[PDB]
Curated annotation (Swiss-Prot):
Keywords: Carbohydrate metabolism, Cellulose degradation, Glycosidase, Hydrolase, Polysaccharide degradation. It comes from the Bacteria. The active site is at residues 164, 353. It catalyses: Hydrolysis of terminal, non-reducing beta-D-glucosyl residues with release of beta-D-glucose. This is Beta-glucosidase B. Its EC number is 3.2.1.21. Belongs to the glycosyl hydrolase 1 family. The keyword Hydrolase applies. GO terms for biological process: cellulose catabolic process. Pfam families: Glyco_hydro_1. One of its GO terms (molecular function) is beta-glucosidase activity. The keyword Oxidoreductase does not apply.
Length: 445
């Protein structure tokens, strides 16, 4: 078995601002909804907060150098909205200088950046006005996106508008699992609509400002399997798929929300009253590429409970990461095929995030994470088959250059190919990272 990837295949690693930066109250940064969320008992394991994190705010120059010598040519990172707009009518020059400096380091190292505008760290002052449940917030996003595009843009080759609309809306306002932590389906769906519009707002700004960099949204998507052949389990699986995949993909490519899901949500949608004339047109802008984040699949069975979808995920025990997520690379191939099928069909596809959190152990100064290594290798084999079969896959970013604040999981789960000693902040590439270095060198494995 020998796998060779396209000549121009984009290889990179990704991170997000709140998960790795630290310096939460430095350089004028004011709190994000996560700084507040992490303080609510029971919301984050161990009660962890993004305070300090990997202290990237102070070690960025070394981290990008580590990337370079690790063989990477692409780096996707996000900007912390709170550093840019710490309060209404602000515009923090000190915040813009951090990224300007980050970008100087990237360029000096010869790296190509991808800047993600929104990676879940909404400024708390905005959430105080109602957050994503308010149309007005889109105006604030305009302010943010415009500033970032004017101060940069002539230096940004890749624009990633919104990272996972699903998580920010559904988990952030519906299940209460992510910040701000509301549990109101009405707000969640309104929130999802507003965030999708922000991809449109950023897209409109991009064309108006005449920027040349590629622009695209990033959706987390998962392959969905029915637990059994029972008709209700198949219907249940259809619902999960509409819930996470179609609800966001349909508006992006087809200008509409899944009718079957629109009917199921019924009263929570309150007649789609939050949808204003032109909104759907604003949202339907695929851009230059579709960003995809993939990790696992779901096995769904039907239930007649009190939940929104009335669905239960049967958890697999064999082949799973340190987070209990099943490792099923085959599903990754099926999903990419399906995405090409409906939605993108020709449009370049970019895997902005793929990776695994395994239990690490430092032995003789090294991290023999054969598990994480195998996980990445196998999913790449899936990507290979999609390619070679015509699939328009053009790049792959391993999620987590560094172990970091893994949201509700806290620091207990490590996704990095590079190990972080939280007691000293010392960085140490894991074996999976070394394997990745040479792999990109041969661009194949």
């Amino acid at each position: 078995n020998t796998f060779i990837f396209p000549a121009t295949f984009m290889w990179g690693t990704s991170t997000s601002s709140y998960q790795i930066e630290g310096g939460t109250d430095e350089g004028g940064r004011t709190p994000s909804i996560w700084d507040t969320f992490c303080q609510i008992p029971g919301k984050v394991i161990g009660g962890d907060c993004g305070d300090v994190a990997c202290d990237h705010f102070h070690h960025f120059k070394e981290d990008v150098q580590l990337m370079k010598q690790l063989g990477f040519l692409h780096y996707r990172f996000s900007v912390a909205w709170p550093r840019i707009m710490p309060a209404a009518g602000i515009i923090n020059e000190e915040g813009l200088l951090f990224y300007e400096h980050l970008l100087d380091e990237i360029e000096l190292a010869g790296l190509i950046p991808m800047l993600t505008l929104y990676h879940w760290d909404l400024p708390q002052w905005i959430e105080d006005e109602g957050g994503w449940t308010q149309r007005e917030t889109i105006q604030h996003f305009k302010t943010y996106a415009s500033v970032i595009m004017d101060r940069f843009g002539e230096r940004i080759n890749w624009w990633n508008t919104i990272n996972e609309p699903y998580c920010a809306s559904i988990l952030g306002y519906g299940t209460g699992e992510h910040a701000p932590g509301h549990e109101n389906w009405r707000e969640a769906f309104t929130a999802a609509h507003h965030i999708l519009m922000c991809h449109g707002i950023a897209s409109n700004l991009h064309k108006e400002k005449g920027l040349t960099g590629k622009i695209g949204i990033t959706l987390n998507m998962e392959h969905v399997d029915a637990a059994s052949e029972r008709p209700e389990d198949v219907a249940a699986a259809i619902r999960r798929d509409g819930f996470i995949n179609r609800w966001f993909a349909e508006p992006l490519f087809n200008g509409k929300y899944p009718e079957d899901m629109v009917e199921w949500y019924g009263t929570y949608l309150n007649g789609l009253d939050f949808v204003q004339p032109g909104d759907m047109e604003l949202i339907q802008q695929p851009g230059d590429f579709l960003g995809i984040n993939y990790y696992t699949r779901s096995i769904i069975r039907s239930t007649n409970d009190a939940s929104l979808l009335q669905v239960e995920q049967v958890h697999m025990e064999e082949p799973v990461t340190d987070m209990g997520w099943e490792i099923h690379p085959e599903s990754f191939y099926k999903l990419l095929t399906r995405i090409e099928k409906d939605f993108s069909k020709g449009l370049p596809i970019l895997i902005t995030e793929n990776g695994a959190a395994m239990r690490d152990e430092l032995v003789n100064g090294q991290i023999e994470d054969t598990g994480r290594q195998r996980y990445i290798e196998e999913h790449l084999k899936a990507c290979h088959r999609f390619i070679e079969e015509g699939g328009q896959l053009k790049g792959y970013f391993v999620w987590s250059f560094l172990d970091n604040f893994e949201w509700a999981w806290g620091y207990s789960k490590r996704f990095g190919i590079v190990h972080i000693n939280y007691e000293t902040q010392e960085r140490t590439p894991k074996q999976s990272a070394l394997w990745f270095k040479q792999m990109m060198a041969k661009n194949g494995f």
